[PDB]
Structure formats: C-alpha cells, structure tokens
Symmetry: D3
Subunit: 159 residues, 6 copies
C-alpha cells in the first residue's frame, strides 16, 4: 500500500546503501531501489551491472524491487505509484545538494514526499567514490561492500 522509491547511481551499491534500503523496508510496505543510468557521471559499472549487483545484494529483503531507469526520477516515481522518495544523508555537501533536489522534485511532483535517513555510524564516512578510489589502489574494501559487489569490483579492476 505505501510505496517508496530509493533512487541513486549505486556505482556500486555499498553497505551504506544496504543500511538505508533496509531501514526503508522497515518503514514502508514496498521499496523500489531505483538505479539511475547517470551517464554524466561516467559510471564504472554499466546500468545492467549495477542492477544485477543490487538485486543480489538485496535478495534477502522480501519487499525490495530493483529497477534501473533513465527517466526523470520524479516521473519514474509517479510511474511506480510511489509517494515517498528515500535518500540517505551523509555530510553537509550531501544535505545541501539533497535540499536542491527535493525542492526541484517537489516542483515536479508535489505529492512525492522526500524523506531522509541518517546512516549508521559504521557507514557515515564512506561512499561509492571513496571505495572505488581505495580499491583502485589495491586497498581492502571488503568491510564496505556486499560480498557479491566486492567480487565484482575486484574482478572489474583486475581487467
């Protein structure tokens, strides 16, 4: 009945993302983990890779649905019959950008309510960007990623 969308680039999905979507499923009946194509960010993993990684990483959560999209997130939320948009908040830079996004999304879809969750202390200082940078220099990021994602990141960089 209550449907929420959790959009992001998820390049790749981290334990921080896993924490947020898990909390979302404890709050709403159905959660769409929505992976934006984000070509402007030149992602390391293709959209199809990121969807598969997230599907495996969230298979244990019964009310999570992983979908990729290139639409405007506001339209995609409407077309998923979502009335809640989930984002995790990490730092001041996040907050300020999320504010901009939320006000734009409110303009585009006024009945879509943006709600923010604060991550666990364990994940409050990591990001996909940071994890990739450490991995690019062969540092150990097993603690920060789902097993399947760590394998795929290692495999990716080994090529």
């Amino acid at each position: 009945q209550k449907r929420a969308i959790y959009p992001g680039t998820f390049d790749p999905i981290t334990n921080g993302h896993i924490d947020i979507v898990t909390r979302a499923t404890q709050m709403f009946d159905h959660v769409i983990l929505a992976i934006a194509a984000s070509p402007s960010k030149k992602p390391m993993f293709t959209l199809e890779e990121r969807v598969a990684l997230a599907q495996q990483a969230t298979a244990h959560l019964g009310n999570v649905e992983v979908v990729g999209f290139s639409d405007l997130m506001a339209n995609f939320a409407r077309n998923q019959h979502a009335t809640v948009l989930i984002r995790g908040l990490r730092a001041v830079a996040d907050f300020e950008y999320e504010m901009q996004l939320a006000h734009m999304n409110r303009h585009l879809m006024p009945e879509l309510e943006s709600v923010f969750l604060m991550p666990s202390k364990e994940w409050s200082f990591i990001s996909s960007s940071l994890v990739k940078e450490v991995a690019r220099h062969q540092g150990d990021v097993t603690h920060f990623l789902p097993e399947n994602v760590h394998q795929a990141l290692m495999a990716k960089l080994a090529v």
Copy 2:
C-alpha cells in the same frame, strides 16, 4: 499501523511546524505531535498554552494527536509505541545537531527510526525563536503563524 511522533517545544507552533506535521500525516497512519515541557529554555508560552494552540492549529488533521510530555524523547516514543520520529530539517546547523540527536536516539531506542522532512521554501528560513524575536520588536509575523497562534502572540506581547 505506523505510529510516528513529531516532538518539539513548539513555542509557539508556526506554519513551518504545520507544514511538517501535515506532510507526516500524509505518510503515516497516526502522528503524535509531542510538545516538550522544555523548562530549561524558559518558553514564552506555558505548556498548556502550547498544547492548546497546537490542537486548534491541527484540528483539521484527522490523524494528529497533540500530547505534552516531560520525558526523554526516546522514552516517550517507546511508551507511545511509535516506530518513527519526525524531524524537520532547515539549515546546515539543523542538520549537524539532528545528526547528533539521531545517533543518540538510535543508541537509546534502536527500534525507533528518525526520518527527516524538508519544509516548503515558504517556511525554510523561520523558527519559533526568530518569529518571537521579530514580534517582540514590533515586526509583522502574521504570515508565519496560524491565526489562533497570531492572536495569542499579540495578546501575550501586549502583556
């Protein structure tokens, strides 16, 4: 099914608060607007005034319950069987303090989720303290308050 609390001092309740609680009622089945006694900040309105003002200002919202409390926010939420704690986010200063409170509340009550809502642009720059400061110095705050609150504030300041 989902019970949420929206705690604060509400000294007095503003249109920013009304915006946040209205958004909350569109998200959750039952919202407790929880008014802290907050003696340490020496509020302008008494607790009984603040509760009465907030009840009148939210009477049109069918699933809002206005309740006073003097306990720790987490203790009151636990006793009310609430699993969601609503907070509005205004500025960076908000965010950092709310981050603190959220991590403390997660420690005190792990089954309580803190969710942050974003106010309309219309109310993004006001607070109870700013409204009181302007009104005390003979500025016009009509636009920022429910009618009943505006009347009570004028009466208060006329001493």
Copy 3:
C-alpha cells in the same frame, strides 16, 4: 557614476540570475552583466549564445549592459571602470568558494569591492547545472528560465 559588474558563466542565465541583476540595478547606476567564457567548465551554450540569451532576458532593464569576456575578471572589472563586483549567494558551498574568489580578487584589485546578494526564496535552490539536468531528462523547467532561454534550451536539447 557607480558602476558594478555581475560576472558568471550564465550557462544559461536563469531566473535566479535575473533576480540578482535586477536587484543590482536597483542599487547601482550601471550594471555590467559579464559572461565568462569558462572553457574549463565545457559550457552547453557558446559564449555568443549566452550573451545573446542574457541580452534578450535583460532587455527590459535600462541600466544593464551584457558583455562577454575571457579576461581575468579582476582586470575586466578595472577595464569597465567598475568598483563593485556582484555575486549571488545560494548555499554553503557557494559561500566558501565565493570567499576564496573575493579574497583573490581583493589581492588583484583592492579597490574592487565584492558584495553579495541573497536570492529570493523562489530561486534559492536552483542553478544552471540543476536546470540543465532536469531538462536533459525532459522535465519541465519553464518556471525557472526566461522565456527566450527556455526556448533555446529546448531547441538545444532537441538536437
């Protein structure tokens, strides 16, 4: 007599920019809207496009002069006999970068005073970057741009 420069990339000029330059004209006798070439930012519109867009968008303001430039803004301000440099302030990230810029410009031209204006609430959460991103995904940005700019942005993306 009092001459001010309002420099920026204006890729493209938004209603937020229009608000700032309009306020500038209410404060100073002559305002130079100065469009930096900004090749490092790889702008969507060429400098000649951006100048024409801004000229049309500000034609109703009698004391606005639109000029493009690739010089150091401090030298360009001196060569325009400007003693005030206008910038609009939006978020914390803006403020911190504008501070850096102002201190550098003060080093380069000590008699050029940098003054900052805060935008209307309506435009406090938009930017050229955000508007382009929404438009790239076919979202409606008519509310955020001058008519001529919206047409040109639509036309640009339709190719």
Copy 4:
C-alpha cells in the same frame, strides 16, 4: 542619494567593524552605523558607551552617522529612509543566520536590500565576543581594536 544602514550591537566595535563600515562608505553616499540597545544579550558596554566609542572610532569617515536604536532593524531602516542594509559575513555560521535574517527583512521591508560584505583576512576570525573573552582572561587584544576602544576595555576590565 543612496542611504545604507550598518546595524549591530558593537559591544565593543572592533577593527572588523571598522573595516566593514569603511568599505560601505566607499560604496554608498551615506552610511548610518546603527547601534542596537540589545538588552537581551546583556552587553558589556552600555549603549551610551558603545555609541561614544563608535563615533570616536569612525570620526575620520565623513559620511558615517552613528545612531543608537531600540526598534526592529527593519523599522529603523524604514524610518531612516535607508534602502541598503549592510552585514559582514565571517563564517558558515554567520552565513546561515544572515540568510534567515535577510529573508525575514525582505518580508518586513521589501524595498530594503541586504548586501553582504566580506572582511579582510586580518579580521576574518574575530568577533566582539571573542575579543571580550580573550581580554577577560588576560589575553592581548590590542591588535583587534581601535585605540580608544582598547583603552575603554582595559578600564572596564580593571573594574
């Protein structure tokens, strides 16, 4: 023609304030240095002390007028026929509070423009409160104050 007000508590006026008001006088025809009674913060110097100190410290500026006021900043600016309100910006904490005040002042007096000036690097880390705190604890604040203010502060602290 252009009348600007520079309001504050100036308890006491520092070289940071002198820097800001000096820059203002180079921008606008007439600058009112407006000293708030500010009883709620319990100032160290009385209003008559603060006005006298500021007058002496700005006597070399021909187009500065030092005036005390107890009204709302917007009410005083309106009554003084000022169309510019000067504020100095120091840090992020400044910025966010000044943003609030600016939006409130625009609501209260739309014909009043808030303009923000940036202090010299020399004064970017001081405030009246910090200076008083250092001086009270037997630290050297000579570098941060006009001579007349430094003398009065020593006299005050000798009690």
Copy 5:
C-alpha cells in the same frame, strides 16, 4: 621532549575525551590534560570533581598529567612550556569555532601549534552537554562514559 596540552571543561570527561587524549599520548612525550575552571558556563561538576574524575579515568596513561587552570589557554600553555595544543574536531560547527580559536591562539602565542585530532566514529556524535542532557532526562549514557564518571553522574543526578 614535546609537551602538549589538551584543554577543555571536561564537564564531565567522556569516552570521546579519553579517545583524544589517548591518541595524543601516542604522539607526544608528555600530555597535560588541562581542565578549565570555566565558571561562565556554570558546569555541572565542580573543578575538583572534574579533575578527580579525569585523573582516575586516565590513570592508565603514564604520560598524562591532569591539571586545573583558570588562565587563558595560551597563558597556561606558555607557562607549562607546551608547544602543542590538542583539540578534537567533531562537526562543522566545531571546525569553524576551532578555526577562530586557533587563529587567536597563534596571535597570542606564535610558538604554540594547534593540532586537531579526529575522534573515533564511536564518539563522533557525543559531547559533555549531550550526555548530561540525556542523563538528566533519564536516558542511558553508560556507553559514553568511563565507569568512574558514570557512577559520579548517577550520584549527582540523584541529588
């Protein structure tokens, strides 16, 4: 050879403080844990209580010296022949205020270097004030304090 001071009110000392001072002892030969009398903030524990609590809580650290002081931090560091001043950084609000203090301390004592340490994620969201606030309102703060401090806090709050 290197003497460092770690000043604060420590009202009361928390596991965050213990973390910072422990890291300091691993960096410098001798660390003075300097407890400010700080009457202006009206501390919950007296100075003699705060010193006694901190001594017990740091007895396992061989190169820590706990000392009370009522002078300016810079004056005390000079008199203790310390050339390093330790401060912990928690949030953005910390950072900006510490930046101020550091620039003032460099002016007052140029031969004193301010170094900023970062607390563990475990303690990154707590402070003495937050701990007192939670404990006063019947919240569990056992995890955040040394055992001896927890006992003294309970005793204090039982009044």
Copy 6:
C-alpha cells in the same frame, strides 16, 4: 624517531603547502612530503615535475624528504615507518572530505594518526586549483607560490 607523512597532489606546491610542511617540521623529527600521482585529477604537472618543484621549494628545511608515490597512501605511510599523517585544513568542504579520508585511513592503518593543521590567515583562501585558474588568465600569482614554482607555472602556461 617520530616520523610524519604529508601527502597530497601538490599540483603545484603553494605557499600554503609550504606553511603546513614547515609547521610539521617544527613538530616532528622527520617529515615525508609525499606527492600522490593522482592521475584521476589529470594534474597540470607530471609527478616528476611536482617532486622536483617541491624538492627545490623545501630544500631549506633539513628534515623534509620529498617522495612521489602511486601507492595507497596508508600503505605508503606504513612503508615509510610513519605514524602521523599531516593534512592542512582550509574550508568546510576540506574538513568533510578530510574526515572521510581519515576514517578510511584509520580502517586501513589504525596506528597511523591523522593530525590536521590550520593554515596561516595569509594562505587560508588559496589552493592549487585557484592559483592555476588565475595564472591561466594571466593574473599575478607571485605572492602565492615559491619562486621556482612560479617560474615553472609561467613557463608551463607560456607553452
């Protein structure tokens, strides 16, 4: 005996960097100025150029060692037997990113203590990026760079 690493891209090294490393040498017995290859940032100067520039710029400091590296900084610090990692803190954006880095480095090398220094007021608003931008537009940056670096930057841009 006490060994510290000061890592960064140093593209090119500025007087701000010189201030930080100089302060580091006043605090620790041996300082490794470590220049990260940073190919993702597409540096203006090659690693070998940046090392030579930094060597010349720090030749007057007896206990500075300039080394380039492409390793993970945490591993490089271990392999240099460094137990302190120095970073200068400039703005809020710096602080938030440095926090992320420090927590990651603590995960990778728990006995490596990250310590932050606040730069002199003179250099608190400059960066390699800003200096390059001014130089690209033929503005005078002699005040911000060591002589040898200014020459090399001029030479670079003259080609």
